[PDB]
Ligand binder design. Structure first.
Ligand code: NA
Lengths: 99, 99
C-alpha cells in the first residue's frame, strides 16, 4: 500500500492474537505497544530518557501483520499513550519513504 | 529519493538561509526547528502536553528545501532536542510511505 500523510498514519495491526491500532512512526527507533500478554521470556529495557526512563518488557522475534504483510521483530510492551510501529518493524515490512 | 529506514531518516534542510539537520517523522503532526531568526510576524503556539506545554513561535508559509525539493508550510520555532519534519511538511514534499 501507498500511505499519504494528510492524516495520521494509523493502521490496524494483528499481534499476539489481538488487533490493535498503531501509528507508523519513522522517527521512532523501536516498536512500543500497550499491554498484551505475549508468551515466553522477555528482557528488561528502559525507554524514554527526558525526565527519566520507563521500564518495559522487550519481546524478541514477535510476529505482527499490517495490511496483509507479515513482519518479525522486537516489540516492547509497556505504557505508551499511542501504540508505535517504529523503524525496527518498518524495515521488516519493506517500508520506505518516497518523495 | 527513496529512503530506507535501517538508519534514522536524517536529512539536510535549507530553511531561513541556513542549513540544518532534521528528522523525517511521520508520527509528528508539525514541523519544529531549534532557533532560527525567521522574518516577520508569528503566532504563539503551545506544543507538547504530557507534563505541560512549551510555548513556541508559529511561522506560516515558510519555504524549506529537502533533497532538491521545495515545500511551503508552517514551521514552529522553539526548543526541541532534534529538529522534526512532520506530516504538515511531508505532504508538501509529496512524501508517502510504501510497503
Ligand atoms: Na515519528
Amino acid at each position: 500500500p501507498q500511505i499519504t500523510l494528510w492524516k495520521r498514519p494509523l493502521v490496524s495491526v494483528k499481534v499476539g492474537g489481538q488487533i490493535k491500532e498503531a501509528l507508523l512512526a519513522t522517527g521512532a527507533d523501536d516498536t512500543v505497544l500497550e499491554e498484551i500478554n505475549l508468551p515466553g521470556k522477555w528482557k528488561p529495557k528502559m525507554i524514554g530518557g527526558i525526565g527519566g526512563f520507563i521500564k518495559v518488557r522487550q519481546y524478541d522475534q514477535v510476529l505482527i501483520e499490517i495490511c496483509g504483510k507479515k513482519a518479525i521483530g522486537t516489540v516492547l510492551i509497556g505504557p505508551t499513550p499511542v501504540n508505535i510501529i517504529g523503524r525496527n518493524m518498518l524495515t521488516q515490512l519493506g517500508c520506505t519513504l518516497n518523495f
